[PDB]
Design a protein around this ligand. Structure first.
Ligand code: HEM
Length: 295
């Protein structure tokens, strides 16, 4: 009994690449519009974290969770303490979903992250459509998303459930160059770097160049802080405590074009975990940025 479920992607009725490019633009044009958010950081980082959390619930052993069903719209997943603060990213996409009611929740949640990465001068991320909304009883329970106070052994074993290897783990972790930690959300405070809304390899550079000291924040949690004002979660710092993670961290710090390649592969794999694309399914889309369109 209990065999892994199969989630077959179904492209929305009469929708092609041009339809989803208009959803990309509406997201991208609203990114440069609502620039005041979070001390002028912008909704860029919160949309990338939203796409990762709606996908990070996947369990490869029974094919439960994932980005397919768009179950973040339900109260159980919406009120997950691990998702504290993501409601800002949800509210950003609400007027966009009203303009495009044909697109599914799972497609819009994942496309929001893909748009935010590219519009913040990141790598191109191929994106496939076809996610189908599933009922509220398919919502995964709380507690599938990772804790921040753990070590590299936990990081490696957690991502094994998402079918990620060491190279994919370190690459996905480079997204922490975006945004900051908020004490009201996670019990951690501070940004990882200086360019909080530009997708670069600054995460790995600061991990190797700053003098990190383990300190205690106002929430009684311990986080690594440097004299420049940056911070690293214990799971961030485990990437240089582990010798196999460290070699990859030093690699991305010395080559951003390489980090862009491995992030684009791992981030798309994360957003597509648990989805079965049939033989007649369309090819992954590479959306043009607003700059490339003159818009
Ligand atoms: C072991 C893995 C990870 C842990 C423990 C972790 C933990 C955290 C925590 C605690 C925050 C603080 C959020 C807040 O206080 O508002 C955060 C923020 C963030 N995370 Fe992660 N994360 C992990 C992996 C990832 C991945 C895989 C991605 C993207 C692919 C990602 C993207 C982000 C972004 C962009 C933010 C900034 C949010 C904002 O500024 O609003 N993280 N992370």
């Amino acid at each position: 009994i209990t065999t892994p479920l199969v989630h077959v992607a179904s492209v929305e009725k009469g929708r092609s690449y041009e339809d989803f490019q208009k959803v990309y633009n509406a997201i991208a044009l609203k990114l440069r519009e609502d620039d005041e958010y979070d001390n002028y950081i912008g909704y860029g980082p919160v949309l990338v974290r939203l796409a990762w959390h709606i996908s990070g619930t996947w369990d490869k052993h029974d094919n439960t969770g994932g980005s397919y069903g768009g179950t973040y719209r339900f109260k159980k997943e919406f009120n997950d303490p691990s998702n504290a603060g993501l409601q800002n990213g949800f509210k950003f996409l609400e007027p966009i979903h009203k303009e495009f009611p044909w697109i599914s929740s799972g497609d819009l949640f994942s496309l929001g992250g893909v748009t935010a990465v590219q519009e913040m001068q990141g790598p191109k991320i191929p994106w496939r459509c076809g996610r189908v909304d599933t009922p509220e009883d398919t919502t995964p329970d709380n507690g599938r998303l990772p804790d921040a106070d753990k070590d590299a052994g936990y990081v490696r074993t957690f991502f094994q459930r998402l079918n990620m290897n060491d190279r994919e783990v370190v690459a996905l972790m480079g997204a922490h160059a975006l945004g900051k930690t908020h004490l009201k959300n996670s019990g951690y405070e501070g940004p990882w770097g200086a360019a909080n809304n530009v997708f670069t390899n600054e995460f790995y550079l600061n991990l190797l160049n700053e003098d990190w000291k383990l300190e205690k924040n106002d929430a009684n949690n311990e986080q690594w802080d440097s004299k420049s004002g940056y911070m690293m979660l214990p799971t961030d710092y485990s990437l240089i405590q582990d010798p196999k993670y460290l070699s990859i961290v030093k690699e991305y710090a010395n080559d951003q074009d390489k980090f862009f390649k491995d992030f684009s592969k791992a981030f798309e794999k994360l957003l597509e975990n648990g989805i079965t694309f049939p033989k007649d399914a369309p090819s992954p889309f590479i959306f043009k940025t607003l700059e490339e369109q003159g818009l």
